[PDB]
Structure 1
Amino acid sequence: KYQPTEANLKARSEFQDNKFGIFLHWGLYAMLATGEWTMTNNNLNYKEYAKLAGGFYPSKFDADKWVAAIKASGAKYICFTTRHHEGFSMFDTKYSDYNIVKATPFKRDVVKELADACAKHGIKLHFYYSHIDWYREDAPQGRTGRRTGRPNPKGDWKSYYQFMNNQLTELLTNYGPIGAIWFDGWWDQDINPDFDWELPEQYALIHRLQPACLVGNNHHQTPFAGEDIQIFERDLPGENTAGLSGQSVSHLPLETCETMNGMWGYKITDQNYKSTKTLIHYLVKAAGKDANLLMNIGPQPDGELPEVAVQRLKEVGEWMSKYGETIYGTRGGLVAPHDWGVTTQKGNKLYVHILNLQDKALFLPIVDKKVKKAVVFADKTPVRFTKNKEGIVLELAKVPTDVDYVVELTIDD
Structure 2
Amino acid sequence: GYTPSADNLKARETFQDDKFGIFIHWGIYSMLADGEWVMHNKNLNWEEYAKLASGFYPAKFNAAEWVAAIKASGAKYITITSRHHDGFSMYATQQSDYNIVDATPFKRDVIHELADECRKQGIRLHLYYSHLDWRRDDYYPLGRTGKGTGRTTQGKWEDYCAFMNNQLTELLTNYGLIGAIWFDGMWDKDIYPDGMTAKTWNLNEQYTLIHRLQPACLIGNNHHITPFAGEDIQIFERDLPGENKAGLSGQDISRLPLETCETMNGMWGYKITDQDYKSTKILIQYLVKAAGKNANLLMNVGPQPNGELPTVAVQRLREMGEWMKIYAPTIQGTRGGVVTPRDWGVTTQKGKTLYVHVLNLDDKALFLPYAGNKLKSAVEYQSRKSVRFIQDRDGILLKFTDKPHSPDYVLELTFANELPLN
Alignment partners' CA distance in 2, 1:388 and 1:399: 23
Alignment partners' CA distance in 1, 2:359 and 2:253: 24
Indicate conservation of the 8 Å contact 2:372/2:393, yes or no: no
Match of 1:409 among 383, 406, 413: 413
Counterpart AA for 1:190: D
Match of 1:297 among 286, 301, 308: 301
Counterpart AA for 2:275: Q
Equivalent residue number for residue 192 of structure 2: 192
Alignment partners' CA distance in 1, 2:180 and 2:157: 25
Alignment partners' CA distance in 1, 2:405 and 2:326: 17
Alignment partners' CA distance in 1, 2:284 and 2:193: 39
Equivalent residue number for residue 135 of structure 1: 135
Are positions 1:95 and 2:99 aligned together?
no
Measured after TM superposition, the shift of residue 369 of structure 1 is: 1.6
Counterpart AA for 1:212: A
**Pairs within 5 Å for 1:137-152:** 137-140=137-140, 141-152=142-153
Report the 3-state secondary structure (helix = DSSP H, G, I; strand = E; otherwise coil) of the residue aligned with 1:103. Answer: coil
Measured after TM superposition, the shift of residue 137 of structure 1 is: 1.5
Measured after TM superposition, the shift of residue 127 of structure 1 is: 0.1
Q: Deviations over 1:57-110 (max 9, x none)?
A: 000000000000000000000000000001000001011000000000000000
Match of 2:318 among 308, 314, 319: 314
Alignment partners' CA distance in 2, 1:142 and 1:16: 34
Alignment partners' CA distance in 2, 1:222 and 1:350: 30
**Pairs within 5 Å for 1:161-180:** 161-180=161-180
Equivalent residue number for residue 126 of structure 2: 126
Point out where structure 1 has 5 or more consecutive residues left out of the alignment. none
Q: Which stretch of structure 1 is more off in the superposition, 124-133 or 379-388?
A: 379-388
Measured after TM superposition, the shift of residue 182 of structure 1 is: 0.1
Equivalent residue number for residue 376 of structure 1: 380
Equivalent residue number for residue 62 of structure 1: 62
Counterpart AA for 1:16: Q
Equivalent residue number for residue 210 of structure 1: 214
Equivalent residue number for residue 7 of structure 2: 7
Counterpart AA for 2:288: V
Aligned residue pair count: 412
Report the 3-state secondary structure (helix = DSSP H, G, I; strand = E; otherwise coil) of the residue aligned with 1:36. Answer: coil
Counterpart AA for 1:297: V
Counterpart AA for 1:186: M
What's the TM-score once normalised by structure 2's chain length? 0.97
Q: Deviations over 1:304-331 (max 9, x none)?
A: 0000000000000000000000001100
Alignment partners' CA distance in 2, 1:287 and 1:394: 22
Alignment partners' CA distance in 2, 1:371 and 1:337: 20
**Pairs within 5 Å for 1:30-49:** 30-49=30-49
Counterpart AA for 1:145: G
Provide runs of 4+ in structure 1 moved above 6 Å.
none
Measured after TM superposition, the shift of residue 389 of structure 1 is: 4.5
Indicate conservation of the 8 Å contact 2:234/2:256, yes or no: yes
What's the TM-score once normalised by structure 1's chain length? 0.99
Alignment partners' CA distance in 2, 1:166 and 1:400: 55
Alignment partners' CA distance in 1, 2:161 and 2:27: 22
Measured after TM superposition, the shift of residue 112 of structure 1 is: 0.3
Equivalent residue number for residue 365 of structure 1: 369
Equivalent residue number for residue 81 of structure 1: 81
Q: Deviations over 1:316-363 (max 9, x none)?
A: 000000000000110000101000000000011000000000111111
Are positions 1:391 and 2:395 aligned together?
yes
Point out where structure 2 has 5 or more consecutive residues left out of the alignment. 418-422
Counterpart AA for 2:296: N
Report the 3-state secondary structure (helix = DSSP H, G, I; strand = E; otherwise coil) of the residue aligned with 2:315. Answer: helix
Equivalent residue number for residue 114 of structure 1: 114
Report the 3-state secondary structure (helix = DSSP H, G, I; strand = E; otherwise coil) of the residue aligned with 1:216. Answer: strand
Equivalent residue number for residue 420 of structure 2: none
Report the 3-state secondary structure (helix = DSSP H, G, I; strand = E; otherwise coil) of the residue aligned with 1:173. Answer: coil
Q: Deviations over 1:261-311 (max 9, x none)?
A: 000000000000000000001100000000000000000000000000000
Alignment partners' CA distance in 2, 1:39 and 1:156: 23
**Pairs within 5 Å for 1:256-295:** 256-295=260-299
Are positions 1:220 and 2:224 aligned together?
yes
Alignment partners' CA distance in 2, 1:148 and 1:305: 29
Measured after TM superposition, the shift of residue 138 of structure 1 is: 1.1
Percent of aligned pairs with the same amino acid: 71
Indicate conservation of the 8 Å contact 2:375/2:391, yes or no: no
Equivalent residue number for residue 248 of structure 2: 244
Equivalent residue number for residue 338 of structure 1: 342
Alignment partners' CA distance in 1, 2:34 and 2:373: 53
Alignment partners' CA distance in 1, 2:248 and 2:331: 26
Counterpart AA for 2:150: G
Report the 3-state secondary structure (helix = DSSP H, G, I; strand = E; otherwise coil) of the residue aligned with 2:102. Answer: helix
Alignment partners' CA distance in 1, 2:202 and 2:96: 22
